[PDB]
Every structure is written in structure tokens, then in C-alpha cells.
């Protein structure tokens, strides 16, 4: 990866302009651990991350780099470089022109709704990236639709490997609570927890609803699994109304994958290879 001096990056981001790209600045969004800025290096668009002590933020910055060097795939975000300025820490990525799946499902900034067809392809691409990580003995630990980015062709790219671990218990439980498996919430580190998170993501893809909404019933999207199983509601009642091309058969087939992924018992969940196989059969 390219080593940037902090000055190189400050200049390409209009002095790290915290104003949104809609107003004229360079801010595109925010993550865990930093604001993301639009940068331009040699007429190529790049994404820049400017990053709880100084010695603790270093091992979390080194993580994204450690994992991103070992893991390169068509469905993983590509790291282009970094900036080692001691205190100031920056990560540079290939800019995803279509941002996150989260933003594209909510139609943020007026983007049109994703079709069922586009959704199915994104689900498959997201599963392929998780499969590559699991084959390379890595647990993502933060699978969610804000961590699924879309390129120039809406190819799904898993991102954010700051919490990714190699191959177990931990005292420091980290992740996104509305996507987390009961055992991950208990401290277990397992690739099976990632499958569960992916199941929440498949429900987001079918429903177009966020994983958690305080002004909703039920507030957690994974709870709809119980409403359907308890025949209080149907999957037809929950399909995203912002589509014109969804068919009952493939919608039921993706719901069945999500339902299996969301089993409360980690060992009763399918592995990613089975998830990939099942999503492939949905479009065959
Ligand atoms: C209406 N238009 C307006 C433009 C918009 N747009 C394009 C982007 N590009 C984009 N965004 C990223 O992060 C976001 C989603 C939080 C901003 C991002 N993150 C990483 C990454 O891996 N990180 C940091 C860990 C890598 C590449 C990235 N590329 C954002 N918004 C699409 C819709």
C-alpha cells in the first residue's frame, strides 16, 4: 500500500473540509473511529478516513491494515494507502460511488429504490465476501448494511475490518447490538456470529427497513422472524413496497436463508458456503 505523508492528504481533501459534499465540502459520512472524506489523487476519487487513548487507537488503525493486506477479494473494499503521522492517522480507500447499502435502502439524498434484481445480486456479492473471509480464517465481527458498500456497478463490497479477528472469549464486547448474535453479546468470538448478522442484513434487503427504529413495532427487525413464525404477520406484509419486480418465490427463498441465519443456537445456523449455495439457487 502507498504511504502518504499527512500533508499530501490534507491538500487532496480541501484541508479536511468537514462540510458535506452536497454543500461544497469533503465530508461523505462518519464511522466508528472517524469521519470519511472525499479526496482526489491524480484525477482518481478516493475515500479518506481520519481517525480511547493514542496507544489504543494505533492497534485499531493497524488492524484495518493487517487484515486488508491479507484479504483481497472482489467483494471486499480495497485499501489504497495510509498515513503514519503518529498522532494523526489516515486510511485511504477506493471510493465507492454508490456508498452503503444502508443509505441505498433508505434512498438517502434522493437515490432511486434498488430493484429486487439488484438486491439479489448484492446479497450474493455480500455472501461471497464473507465466504472469502471465513476461508482465510477471519471473523468480521461487524457485518451490517452500513459496512456493505456499492461500487460503480452496485457490486457489494464488505468494509471495515477494524474489529476483524484471526483463527474463543473476550472481556471487551464490540459490534452493532441490533445485528449481534446472542453469543456474540456474551463475549464469544465465532464465524457463526457473522452468519447471524448477515441474516439481519437479508431482512433489511427484503423489507427496506433499518435493523432498529425506536418509533416502530417491533423496534428490532430480527423480531419480525417471530411475528411470521407466529402467523401474526406474513412476509408479503413486510416486503419493501419501493419495488415493482419482486416475486413471491425468490422473496420466500431469501427469507428462508435469513430465517436459517437467525437461529438462536449458533450450531443450528448454516455456514457461509451453504448460505452462498442457497442464495445461488434462489436466482437459478
Ligand atoms: C447521493 N450520492 C452521494 C455520494 C455517495 N457516496 C459515495 C461514497 N463513497 C464511499 N463512502 C464510504 O463510506 C461512507 C458510505 C460513509 C461515507 C466509503 N467507505 C470506505 C471504507 O471502507 N471505510 C471508510 C471504512 C471505502 C470507500 C467508501 N466510499 C459515500 N457516499 C453516494 C450517493
Residues 45-48: contacts with CB under 8 Å, at least 24 apart: 45/95, 45/97, 46/12, 46/80, 46/92, 46/93, 46/94, 46/95, 47/92, 47/93, 47/94, 47/95, 47/96, 48/9, 48/12, 48/13, 48/90, 48/91, 48/92, 48/93
Residue at which a domain ends, from 72, 95, 118: 95
Distance (angstroms) between ligand 1 centre and the Cα of 240 equals 24
Which of 23, 28, 30, 82 to mutate to test ligand 1, by most ligand atoms within 8 A of the CB atom? 28
Please tell me whether residues 90 and 100 are part of one structural domain: no
Please tell me whether residues 172 and 142 are part of one structural domain: yes
DSSP state letter for 86: T
Percent helix, percent strand, percent coil in the chain, to nearest 5: 40, 20, 40
The H or E element containing residue 138 is strand 138-139
Please tell me whether residues 49 and 114 are part of one structural domain: no
Helix axes 116-135 and 248-261, enclosed angle (nearest 10): 30
What experiment produced this structure?
Answer: X-ray
Please tell me whether residues 89 and 211 are part of one structural domain: no
Residue 38 CA: distances (Å) to CA of 10, 31, 235: 11, 14, 39
**Deposited resolution, Å:** 2.3
Whether 135 contacts 80, CB under 8 Å? no
Please tell me whether residues 141 and 278 are part of one structural domain: yes
Please tell me whether residues 29 and 56 are part of one structural domain: yes
Please tell me whether residues 162 and 109 are part of one structural domain: yes
Distance CA 173, CA 122 (A): 29
Ligand 1 and 47: CB distance under 6 A:
yes
Residue 10: alpha-carbon gap to chain centroid: 27
Ligand 1 and 49: CB distance under 6 A:
yes
Distance CA 59, CA 46 (A): 23
Total domains present in the chain: 2
Residue at which a domain ends, from 64, 95, 126: 95
Please tell me whether residues 142 and 226 are part of one structural domain: yes
245 tagged catalytic: no
Domain hosting residue 102, numbered range: 96-284
Please tell me whether residues 81 and 217 are part of one structural domain: no
Q: Which residues pair with 91 in a beta bridge?
A: 49, 82
The residue among 2, 34, 42 whose CA lies nearest residue 16 is 34
Ligand 1 and 146: CB distance under 6 A:
no
Please tell me whether residues 59 and 200 are part of one structural domain: no
Is 35 labelled a binding residue? yes
Q: Where are the alpha helices (DSSP H) in the chain?
A: 6-12, 54-70, 101-105, 116-135, 191-207, 224-229, 235-238, 248-261, 272-282
Please tell me whether residues 109 and 249 are part of one structural domain: yes
CA gyration radius, the chain: 19
DSSP, collapsed to helix, strand or coil, labels residue 30 as strand
Residue labelled with grid coordinates 476483524: 164
Distance CA 164, CA 138 (A): 7
Whether 109 contacts 22, CB under 8 Å? yes
Please tell me whether residues 162 and 209 are part of one structural domain: yes
Tally Cβ neighbours within 10 Å of residue 41. 18
The number of CA neighbours under 13 Å toward the Cβ of 58 is 8
Distance CA 255, CA 235 (A): 8
Amino acid at each position: 500500500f502507498h504511504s502518504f505523508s499527512f500533508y499530501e492528504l490534507k491538500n487532496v481533501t480541501n484541508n479536511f473540509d468537514e462540510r458535506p459534499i452536497s454543500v461544497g465540502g469533503n465530508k461523505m459520512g462518519e464511522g466508528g473511529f472517524g469521519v470519511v472524506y472525499k479526496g482526489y489523487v491524480n484525477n482518481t476519487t478516493v475515500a479518506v478516513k481520519k481517525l480511547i487513548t493514542t496507544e489504543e487507537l494505533k492497534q485499531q488503525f493497524d488492524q484495518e491494515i493487517k487484515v486488508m493486506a491479507k484479504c483481497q477479494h472482489e467483494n471486499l473494499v480495497e485499501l489504497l494507502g495510509f498515513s503514519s503521522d503518529g498522532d494523526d492517522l489516515c486510511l485511504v480507500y477506493v471510493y465507492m460511488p454508490n456508498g452503503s447499502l444502508l443509505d441505498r435502502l433508505s434512498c438517502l439524498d434522493g437515490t432511486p429504490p434498488l430493484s429486487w434484481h439488484m438486491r439479489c445480486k448484492i446479497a450474493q456479492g455480500a455472501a461471497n465476501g464473507i465466504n472469502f473471509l471465513h476461508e482465510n480464517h477471519h471473523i468480521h465481527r461487524d457485518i451490517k448494511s452500513a459496512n456493505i458498500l456499492l461500487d460503480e456497478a452496485f457490486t457489494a463490497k464488505i468494509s471495515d475490518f477494524g474489529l476483524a479477528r484471526a483463527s474463543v472469549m473476550t472481556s471487551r464486547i464490540v459490534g452493532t447490538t441490533a445485528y449481534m448474535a446472542p453469543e456474540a453479546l456474551r463475549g464469544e468470538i465465532t464465524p457463526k456470529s457473522d452468519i447471524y448478522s448477515f441474516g439481519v442484513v437479508l431482512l433489511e434487503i427484503i423489507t427496506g427497513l433499518p435493523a432498529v427504529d425506536e418509533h416502530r413495532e417491533p423496534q428490532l427487525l430480527l423480531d419480525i422472524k417471530e411475528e411470521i413464525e407466529d402467523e401474526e404477520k406474513t412476509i408479503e406484509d413486510y416486503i419493501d413496497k419501493k419495488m415493482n419486480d419482486a416475486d413471491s418465490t425468490s422473496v420466500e427463498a431469501m427469507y428462508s436463508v435469513a430465517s436459517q441465519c437467525l437461529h438462536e443456537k449458533k450450531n443450528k445456523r448454516p455456514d457461509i458456503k451453504k448460505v452462498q449455495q442457497l442464495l445461488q439457487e434462489m436466482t437459478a
